[PDB]
Design a protein around this nucleic acid. Structure first.
Lengths: 84, 111, 118, 44, 62, 64
RNA sequence: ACACCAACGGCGAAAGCACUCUGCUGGGCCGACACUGACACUGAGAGACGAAAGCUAGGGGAGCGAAUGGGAUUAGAUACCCCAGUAGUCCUAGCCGUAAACGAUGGAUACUAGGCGCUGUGCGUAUCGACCCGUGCAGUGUUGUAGCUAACGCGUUAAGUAUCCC
């Protein structure tokens, strides 16, 4: 079981959260799924994809979700203000 | 060792949860009603072993005989890996509903 | 007055056309409630995020006789009144321990009524 | 505290869209195939 | 083996009938009883088609 | 994976609770990645353990 | 009444059937020759079952809700919207026997490319144990050759080629 990377991007309007996932005991190829500019859910889409995998351990899913959460959180604050 | 007797009749396993308070007449009297089952069943009645008391999820509604008092969070987890005729299981259900120290008794039929 | 303990639950009945911001202690004796119909305007205006913000602000501005530090919020229901209410409580910024949902999730209990066809 | 919202973000795990679903009437497989076909294809 | 089919279906109808008459509303096993009656009945017309005396013995046995 | 030879019963609370969420609800076959048979058998077993109050019917929501 | 499980999923002859457990009991599928030796198919009239609404008799009645009543919109509103709300909905014992009771496709057998699937079992590989690959069948689905079709399409589960029966 390889281990993992969320990649975020912040531009003022729009978050992207990108989940790159990895192999269980069964050889698999994930992408990085990038979740998108419209208000359509990023955390639900990401976490659900991970749960749908089961190929991801709980520690792995959670660490990536915590990082994802943190960025959505920073993003909400910057959007409500102007940080940039 | 268990597939010796099931030419003739069936195999079950009853899960029954208990009160958390009493430690006496709990291994004793419920084994005496297990002897009432022995008058009923009379087969390889073994492995009536006990499981430790742990906090369950949510339980209300003891229904004592005119008590209707106690909420619960804990319970002693008995399970009887018994073995009987398919006749007279409903009286085991009535015996494991009506008695006080047995609440929420679900029997099963392992294969 | 009250028991004078600065920890206590907050419930937000966010309806589909209203909000109610009530605040009560651990036992459940309410110390104040203030809704969108409480804070003045009433009609199609009530139940919008400005009504959630104003109703939450006028709800918990009157607990300064207590000055509750350890807040915890237990919201309920669908509507446009949740997120503005949480931004109002975080605007007052008191020690919000955890927000939570206690919405009734039925297990096919009663038949919900006719579809609207409007 | 910061102005981050994880209750909305966590809320879409088990969405409040099971409550906008349950306001209107119990109706059979025509609108359960519309809502649950669009929902079985929204998660795939 | 034919008379084990007729006799076996006869005990099938005995045990299923003393099931059904003290029960009275299972409308699923009614088809099982009627498929058994028809299946046995085509067997009895078969063995009657073959023989006389031997089918007379099948009647006299039950 | 995780079949582990021994059959799934309500007494086996190890592989069970890997299948429910912390919210306490049953996950589907395409998430848990089992066969249909494993899915139905843990379904009946999980609902049995739901009767014995080994598992909550609802877990109270939490933050922070 | 039974959320998530719920799946383009399983079962039933159809209607239907999902909270769990037990009891009785139907039906299906697969293997070995273990047995009988054509006992097969269809089926007039007949008989059974047959969603929902309906009716008789007795219970029960939380939600929903024909009729009804009030408010609104409206020129008007017996309607869509809203608030109350009776029969009904549920159960016992019956009657009724109709539905877009739809796959808009009666049943049965034999034969005629493939690809991608799912479900159940069987064999071999691999390990010696869960996998995993091919397969033998049965069932369920999706694209599709030939052929048919007025066309759309159907296409081994034919609307193909033939035979039988209503």
């Amino acid at each position: 079981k390889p281990r993992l990377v969320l990649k975020f991007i912040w531009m003022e309007k729009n978050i992207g959260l990108a989940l790159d996932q990895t192999i269980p005991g069964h050889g698999t190829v994930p992408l990085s799924p990038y979740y998108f500019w419209p208000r359509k859910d990023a955390w639900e889409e990401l976490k659900v994809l991970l749960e749908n995998k089961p190929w991801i351990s709980q520690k792995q899913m959670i660490i990536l979700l915590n990082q994802a959460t943190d960025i959505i959180n920073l993003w909400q604050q910057s959007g409500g203000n102007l940080a940039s | 060792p268990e597939p010796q007797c099931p030419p003739g009749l069936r195999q079950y396993e009853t899960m029954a949860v208990l009160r958390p308070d009493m430690t006496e007449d709990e291994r004793l009297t419920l084994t005496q009603k297990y002897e009432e089952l022995l008058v009923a069943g009379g087969a390889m009645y073994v492995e009536v072993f006990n499981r430790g008391v742990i906090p369950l999820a949510y339980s209300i509604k003891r229904k004592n005989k005119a008590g209707e008092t106690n909420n619960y969070l804990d319970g002693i987890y008995l399970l009887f890996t018994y073995f009987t005729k398919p006749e007279s299981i409903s009286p085991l259900e009535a015996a494991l509903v009506t008695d006080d120290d047995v609440i929420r008794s679900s029997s099963f039929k392992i294969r | 007055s009250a028991r004078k303990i600065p920890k206590g639950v907050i419930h937000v009945q966010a309806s589909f056309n209203n909000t109610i911001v009530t605040v009560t202690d651990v036992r459940g004796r309410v110390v104040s409630w203030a809704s969108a119909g409480t804070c003045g305007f009433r009609g199609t205006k009530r139940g919008t995020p400005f009504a959630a913000q104003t109703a939450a602000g006028n709800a918990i501005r009157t607990v300064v006789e207590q000055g509750m530090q350890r807040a915890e919020v237990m919201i309920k229901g669908p509507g446009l009144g949740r997120d503005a209410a949480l931004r109002a409580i975080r605007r007052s910024g008191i020690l919000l321990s955890f927000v939570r949902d206690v919405t009734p999730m039925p297990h096919n209990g009663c038949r919900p009524p006719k579809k609207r066809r409007v | 505290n910061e102005e981050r919202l994880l209750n909305r973000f966590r809320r879409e795990v088990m969405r409040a869209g099971v409550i906008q679903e349950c306001k209107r009437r119990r109706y059979f497989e025509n609108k359960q195939e519309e809502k649950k076909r669009k929902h079985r294809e929204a998660a795939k | 083996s034919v008379e084990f089919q007729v006799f076996c279906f006869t005990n099938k109808i005995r045990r299923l009938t003393l099931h059904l008459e003290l029960h009275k509303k299972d409308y699923s096993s009614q088809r099982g009883l009627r498929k058994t009656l028809g299946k046995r009945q085509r067997l009895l017309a078969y063995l009657l088609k073959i023989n006389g005396v031997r089918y007379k013995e099948l009647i006299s046995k039950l | 994976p995780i079949q582990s030879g021994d059959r799934i019963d309500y007494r086996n609370m190890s592989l069970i609770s890997r299948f429910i969420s912390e919210q306490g609800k049953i996950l589907s076959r395409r998430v848990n990645r089992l066969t249909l048979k494993q899915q139905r058998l843990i379904t009946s077993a999980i609902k049995q353990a739901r009767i014995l109050s080994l598992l909550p019917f609802l877990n109270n929501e939490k933050q922070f």
